[PDB]
Amino acid sequence: SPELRKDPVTNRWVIFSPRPTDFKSKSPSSCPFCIGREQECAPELFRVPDHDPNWKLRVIENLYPALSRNLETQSRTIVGFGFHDVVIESPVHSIQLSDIDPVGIGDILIAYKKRINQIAQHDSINYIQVFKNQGASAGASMSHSHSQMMALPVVPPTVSSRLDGTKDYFEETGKCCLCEAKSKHFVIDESSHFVSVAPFAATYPFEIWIIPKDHSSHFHHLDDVKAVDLGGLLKLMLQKIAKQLNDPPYNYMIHTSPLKVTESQLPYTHWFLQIVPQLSGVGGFEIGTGCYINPVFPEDVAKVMREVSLT
Amino acid sequence: QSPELRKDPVTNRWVIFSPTDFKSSCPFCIGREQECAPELFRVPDHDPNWKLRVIENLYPALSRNLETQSRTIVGFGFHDVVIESPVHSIQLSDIDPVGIGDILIAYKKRINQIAQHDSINYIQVFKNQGASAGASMSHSHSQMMALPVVPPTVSSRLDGTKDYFEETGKCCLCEAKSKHFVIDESSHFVSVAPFAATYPFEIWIIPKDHSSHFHHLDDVKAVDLGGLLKLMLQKIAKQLNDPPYNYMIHTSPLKVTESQLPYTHWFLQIVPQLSGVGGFEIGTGCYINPVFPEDVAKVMREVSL
Ligand SMILES: *P(=O)(O)OC[C@H]1O[C@@H](n2cnc3c(N)ncnc32)[C@H](O)[C@@H]1O
Ligand SMILES: *P(=O)(O)OC[C@H]1O[C@@H](n2cnc3c(N)ncnc32)[C@H](O)[C@@H]1O
Numbered sequence A: 001s002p003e004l005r006k007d008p009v010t011n012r013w014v015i016f017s018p019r020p021t022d023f024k025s026k027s028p029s030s031c032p033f034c035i036g037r038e039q040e041c042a043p044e045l046f047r048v049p050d051h052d053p054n055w056k057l058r059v060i061e062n063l064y065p066a067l068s069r070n071l072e073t074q075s076r077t078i079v080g081f082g083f084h085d086v087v088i089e090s091p092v093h094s095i096q097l098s099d100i101d102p103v104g105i106g107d108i109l110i111a112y113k114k115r116i117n118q119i120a121q122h123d124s125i126n127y128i129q130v131f132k133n134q135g136a137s138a139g140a141s142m143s144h145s146h147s148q149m150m151a152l153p154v155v156p157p158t159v160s161s162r163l164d165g166t167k168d169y170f171e172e173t174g175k176c177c178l179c180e181a182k183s184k185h186f187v188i189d190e191s192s193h194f195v196s197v198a199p200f201a202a203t204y205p206f207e208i209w210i211i212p213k214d215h216s217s218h219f220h221h222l223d224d225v226k227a228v229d230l231g232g233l234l235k236l237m238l239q240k241i242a243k244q245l246n247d248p249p250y251n252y253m254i255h256t257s258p259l260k261v262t263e264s265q266l267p268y269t270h271w272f273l274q275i276v277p278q279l280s281g282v283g284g285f286e287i288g289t290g291c292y293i294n295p296v297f298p299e300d301v302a303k304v305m306r307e308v309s310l311t
Numbered sequence B: 001q002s003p004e005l006r007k008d009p010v011t012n013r014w015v016i017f018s019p020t021d022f023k024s025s026c027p028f029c030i031g032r033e034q035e036c037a038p039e040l041f042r043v044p045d046h047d048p049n050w051k052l053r054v055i056e057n058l059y060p061a062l063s064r065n066l067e068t069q070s071r072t073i074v075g076f077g078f079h080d081v082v083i084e085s086p087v088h089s090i091q092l093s094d095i096d097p098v099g100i101g102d103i104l105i106a107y108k109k110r111i112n113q114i115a116q117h118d119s120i121n122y123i124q125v126f127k128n129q130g131a132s133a134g135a136s137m138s139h140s141h142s143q144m145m146a147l148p149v150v151p152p153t154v155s156s157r158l159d160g161t162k163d164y165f166e167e168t169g170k171c172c173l174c175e176a177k178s179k180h181f182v183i184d185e186s187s188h189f190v191s192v193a194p195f196a197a198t199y200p201f202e203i204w205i206i207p208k209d210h211s212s213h214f215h216h217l218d219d220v221k222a223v224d225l226g227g228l229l230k231l232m233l234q235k236i237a238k239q240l241n242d243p244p245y246n247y248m249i250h251t252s253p254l255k256v257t258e259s260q261l262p263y264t265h266w267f268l269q270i271v272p273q274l275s276g277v278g279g280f281e282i283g284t285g286c287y288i289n290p291v292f293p294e295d296v297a298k299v300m301r302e303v304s305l
């Protein structure tokens, strides 16, 4: 039977309206991002290893940026100042992120952190969205493995909503709701520093959140040990998704603190990584209301995903 | 042109603008009624020769059987289907303004039935046309979903329009002619490309009178709206090569307070389906719109039918 559920992190109701194990995907050899072709890319910010011609990753400016870094002094309407960068995740054209080894994924995570720390030097930036698209229908335009970073001059709606809901919950219980993840959501897998779950009031079917076990407000406070540990758990979730759902397109999104987060917000602000496989679309109900309809309960997603074997 | 962020009290969120070239028998058929979930009413009333029918959805997202039961709440609600034509190949926009009016008056009838239930707080009337816009059936139809809660866009709209009214003493949709980019105008309605439109070629149809509730619509305004809706849908079809689309009626919460009425003003939103989203939108709840509403209005004002 259908149910509405709410969670402080989304701060909204979702409708659950249902077999879970019957859910499946319904979806060049070179390119400018390939090693050797660097002059065909927008300006480089840095690579790993540093200035090594034999690079493992590169962070570059987006050639078609959504926001303009040249509008900084200019700052109903505000100017479209921001940063839009691309993280090229492999020198090799055909390797997908989930095929990269945990240490290599750790290096990407650490590169997000290095770049965030660079952007955080600009007072005009209020939030940085790190995200990945895999698959045309999940918004990828390039087949080569990569992810993107968009730095914004405003705190966007999800972040505002999250701050509001987590604050209300903290005032109500004295607790950070993500510190309570193992009792509040449905655990899937656990690594040394992170736990993956099917979110109690998940927006999307087979949505998974990977959540630091320690209270951590900022993604970019990640260290190298946590990075490789997170890399391994991210890899695992992506490979279980790819097996269970027949390699669907997907997106992942890092949800982190605003750059000007206040001391008072710290106790209930806890970063996490959201993975959303693309399984279904929306129509007029969701557009009209901002309420989603999820056909699979998280109880059931967790059961399924815990039983996934990769051998 | 140069990117820009824009906000509107109605959405109460920033959108990033970052830029004429933009482009895209069954069980509901007259003679197949026993094959549907229970009929609620039809038009003409009890006429075997129906022009529209309002039925229960066969696969409802919320359960009408959970009313007595009501971080979790029971999935009580009403999920209904409005069948807009007895004829299988007719699209909504092909219907004459009066017939579209009838459909709008039927939405009104059904809202007033639903509003008799204290457990309902908001009713979303919406249409999907085309598989990729969420349609599962090609016969012309729209839907209504009655909810036990006020959903996020409605809460956001109430907040944003409240803020604006507190700062200006004005209802922002009452000023639509000076705030938004006018496309067409009827006797009681105006259609605009919204200043801070979420989606490329989004169009709002706004009542010119300050009207808080859709369902206070009368017969004259229904036919007037019908003709303007038809005009926008036909212009969209022609300019954008008949894309799939959605429309959504934005209206007041059923338990709206007196103090909310001065800045609460219903409207109808039309979204041609032209593009999709990626991790930026999912992560932030901020959209990126490739066409300024200035350019949309200019293109749309020139469409010849
Ligand atoms: P994914 O498909 O999520 O995003 C790809 C982004 O890469 C940008 N882009 C395309 N081509 C180039 C070059 N040559 N250099 C730098 N950036 C590039 C697109 O604008 C996408 O946003
Ligand atoms: P559109 O494609 O937006 O939505 C169609 C809705 O109609 C419901 N439905 C399908 N078939 C039937 C019957 N035989 N009776 C009543 N309702 C029906 C689908 O569940 C869609 O919600």
Ligand SMILES: [Zn+2]
Pocket (backbone or CB within 6 Å): A029, A030, A031, A032, A033, A034, A092, A093, A144
């Ligand atoms: Zn390549």
Ligand SMILES: [Zn+2]
Pocket (backbone or CB within 6 Å): A176, A177, A178, A179, A180, A214, A215, A216, A267, A268, A269, A270
């Ligand atoms: Zn915490």
Ligand SMILES: [Zn+2]
Pocket (backbone or CB within 6 Å): B025, B026, B027, B028, B029, B030, B087, B088, B139
């Ligand atoms: Zn039919």
Ligand SMILES: [Zn+2]
Pocket (backbone or CB within 6 Å): B171, B172, B173, B174, B209, B210, B211, B262, B263, B264, B265
């Ligand atoms: Zn008004």
